[PDB]
Design an enzyme around this catalytic site. Structure first.
Site, PDB file in Angstrom:
ATOM      1  N   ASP A  10      80.991  42.202  63.549  1.00  0.00           N
ATOM      2  CA  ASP A  10      80.287  41.478  64.661  1.00  0.00           C
ATOM      3  C   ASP A  10      81.287  40.042  64.605  1.00  0.00           C
ATOM      4  O   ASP A  10      81.642  39.444  63.673  1.00  0.00           O
ATOM      5  CB  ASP A  10      79.230  41.328  64.413  1.00  0.00           C
ATOM      6  CG  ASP A  10      78.431  40.319  65.398  1.00  0.00           C
ATOM      7  OD1 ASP A  10      77.662  39.333  64.770  1.00  0.00           O
ATOM      8  OD2 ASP A  10      78.655  40.148  66.477  1.00  0.00           O
ATOM      9  N   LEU A  11      81.107  39.715  65.758  1.00  0.00           N
ATOM     10  CA  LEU A  11      81.772  38.225  65.956  1.00  0.00           C
ATOM     11  C   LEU A  11      81.116  37.187  66.592  1.00  0.00           C
ATOM     12  O   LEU A  11      81.233  35.882  66.741  1.00  0.00           O
ATOM     13  CB  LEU A  11      83.276  38.469  66.826  1.00  0.00           C
ATOM     14  CG  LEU A  11      83.977  37.072  66.968  1.00  0.00           C
ATOM     15  CD1 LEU A  11      84.794  36.926  65.687  1.00  0.00           C
ATOM     16  CD2 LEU A  11      85.260  37.386  68.295  1.00  0.00           C
TER      17      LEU A  11
END
Length: 216
Positions: A10-11
């Site tokens: 996830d960013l």
């Protein structure tokens, strides 16, 4: 290490402390429309659900569009400087690289912005494919993110795994048949859903749990 072939991270909340930056623009957005702003626990409580829906959950429905564009502008103005990542994540990315596993991300505040942010930190080229949000449209483009990313990183490897924190990433990864491990980076509010098909998933409290789970 017995790592997979590719790890999709996830960013938005798992990669960086978006809380600081988001609260900044969040305060501006609501104040711009004459609405109050609760401080304190709102930082972690806005981490989890998409800002679009989070703002809609705060009571915005009619003037939601106005507040959204205000948030975007302010985030693009100061939100980029209200973030960081120096912690266990740093050495983690290095160790994962050491194991020979390919890393990528499929979550973004905005792909163009993500390109800039990851380039700023200098971890952009450290990932194979950066994806998350090409455009803000309609329909259930919840699977396309990972799907399109995979078609770019083809051919498709044998071992794939995602690392997130929300029901959005765990469901998407499972939808394509990809295993995932959720962390405990924050504590939102929209955690409990009515439609819960996927109940089983590994939970990593600290960063060291990630490395051992991934098998680096």
């Amino acid at each position: 290490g017995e790592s997979p072939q590719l790890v999709i991270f996830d960013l938005d909340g798992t990669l960086t402390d978006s809380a600081r930056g988001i609260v900044s623009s969040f305060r501006h957005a609501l104040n711009h429309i004459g609405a109050p702003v609760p401080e304190g626990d709102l930082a972690t409580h806005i981490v989890g659900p998409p800002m679009h829906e989070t703002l809609r959950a705060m009571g915005l429905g009619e003037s939601a569009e106005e507040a959204i564009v205000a948030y975007r502008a302010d985030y693009s103005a100061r939100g980029w400087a209200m973030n960081s990542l120096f912690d266990g994540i740093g050495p983690l990315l290095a160790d994962l690289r050491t194991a020979g596993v390919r890393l990528a991300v499929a979550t973004s505040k905005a792909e163009p912005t993500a390109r800039r942010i990851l380039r700023h930190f200098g971890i952009e080229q450290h990932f194979e494919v950066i994806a998350g949000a090409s455009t803000d449209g309609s329909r259930g483009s919840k699977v396309d993110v990972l799907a399109h990313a995979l078609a770019q990183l083809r051919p498709l490897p044998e071992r794939l795994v995602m690392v997130g924190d929300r029901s959005h990433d765990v469901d998407g990864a499972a939808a394509h048949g990809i295993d995932t491990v959720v962390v405990g980076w924050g504590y939102g509010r929209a955690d409990f859903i009515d439609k819960t098909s996927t109940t089983v998933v590994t939970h990593a409290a600290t960063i060291d749990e990630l490395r051992e789970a991934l098998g680096v």
